[PDB]
Amino acid sequence: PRVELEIPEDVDAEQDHLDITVEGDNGSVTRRLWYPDIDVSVDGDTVVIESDEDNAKTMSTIGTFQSHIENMFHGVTEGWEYGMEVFYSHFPMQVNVEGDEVVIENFLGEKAPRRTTIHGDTDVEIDGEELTVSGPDIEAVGQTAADIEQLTRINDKDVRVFQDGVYITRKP
């Protein structure tokens, strides 16, 4: 099979072995697309994902490689933005960005701060009670936003009563 993807005018696409670098105005993203007998190449203006095999396992990954490349196109142009809202019931939670990591203080009354490192060139911007995670790499933005929701995990007590924590509001 063969699937051709036209690169937008704002975008530049290059290739180095199995690695693909996609450039644009909102940044650059490099990904490694490796799978048996699937060749991904840049034909000057279009990106070609082709294989000689048509089996279910090969077809699964051809479709995955398509979505990955199309997402890099959106990333380097428009970008990826996840919206988050901080909620608390009794304890005033301090969600701050300290360097390369986002810190959460006084969560559920804890003395020890909860922290997670931001993945890649992703930027987390705070506006009081609202947070917005953004960047060109969907893998890095999707995870950094997920990491923040996961950072306020509670396994010992009832989550329905103890609902404190930052949650994802908008998914792109």
Partner 1 sequence: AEFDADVIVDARDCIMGRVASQVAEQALDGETVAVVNAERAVITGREEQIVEKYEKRVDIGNDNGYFYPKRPDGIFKRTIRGMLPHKKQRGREAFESVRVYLGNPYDEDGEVLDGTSLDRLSNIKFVTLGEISETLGANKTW
Partner RNA sequence: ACAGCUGGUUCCAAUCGAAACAUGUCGAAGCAUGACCUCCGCCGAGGUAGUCUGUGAGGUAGAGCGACCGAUUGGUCCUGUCAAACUCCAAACUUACAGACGCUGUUUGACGCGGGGAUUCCGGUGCGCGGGGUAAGCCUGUGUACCAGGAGGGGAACAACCCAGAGAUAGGUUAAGGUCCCCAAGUGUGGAUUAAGUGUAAUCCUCUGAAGGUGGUCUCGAGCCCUAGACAGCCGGGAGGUGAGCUUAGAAGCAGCUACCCUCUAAGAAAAGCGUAACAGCUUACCGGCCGAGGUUUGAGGCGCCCAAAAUGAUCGGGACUCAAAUCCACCACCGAGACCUGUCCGUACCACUCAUACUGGUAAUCGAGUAGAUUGG
Partner RNA sequence: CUGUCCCAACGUUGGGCCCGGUGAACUGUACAUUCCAGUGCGGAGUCUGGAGACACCCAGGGGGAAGCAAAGACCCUAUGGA
Partner RNA sequence: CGAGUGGCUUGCUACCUCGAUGUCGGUUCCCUCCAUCCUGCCCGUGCAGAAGCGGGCAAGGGUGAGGUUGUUCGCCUAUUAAAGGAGGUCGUGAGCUAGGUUUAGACCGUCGUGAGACAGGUCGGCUGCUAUCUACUGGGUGUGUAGGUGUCUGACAAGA
Partner RNA sequence: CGCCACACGGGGUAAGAGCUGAACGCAUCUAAGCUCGAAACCCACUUGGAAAAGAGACACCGCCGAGGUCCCGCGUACAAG
Residue 9 near which of partner 1, RNA, Cl ion, none (CB within 5-8 Å, type-dependent): none
- Asked if residues 39 and 50 have their Cβ atoms less than 8 Å apart, the reply is yes
Query: Which one among 2, 17, 57, 90 touches RNA, defined by CB under 7 A?
Result: 57
- Asked if residues 76 and 24 have their Cβ atoms less than 8 Å apart, the reply is yes
Q: 102-121 burial, b if ≥16 CB within 10 A, otherwise e?
A: bebbebbeeeeebebebbee
Residue nearer to RNA on the CB measure, 127 or 158: 158
Binding letters toward partner 1, positions 13-52, x by CB under 8 A: ---------------------xxxx-x-------------
Written as six digits, the tokens of 150 are: 């996961």
Residue 39 near which of RNA, partner 1, Cl ion, none (CB within 5-8 Å, type-dependent): partner 1
- In this structure, what DSSP letter does residue 70 have? H
Query: Residue 169 CB, nearest distance to RNA (Å)?
Result: 13
User: What is the C-alpha to C-alpha distance for residues 11 and 128, in angstroms, rounded to an integer?
Assistant: 35
Residue 61 near which of partner 1, Cl ion, RNA, none (CB within 5-8 Å, type-dependent): RNA
- Binding residues vs Cl ion (CB under 5 A): 36
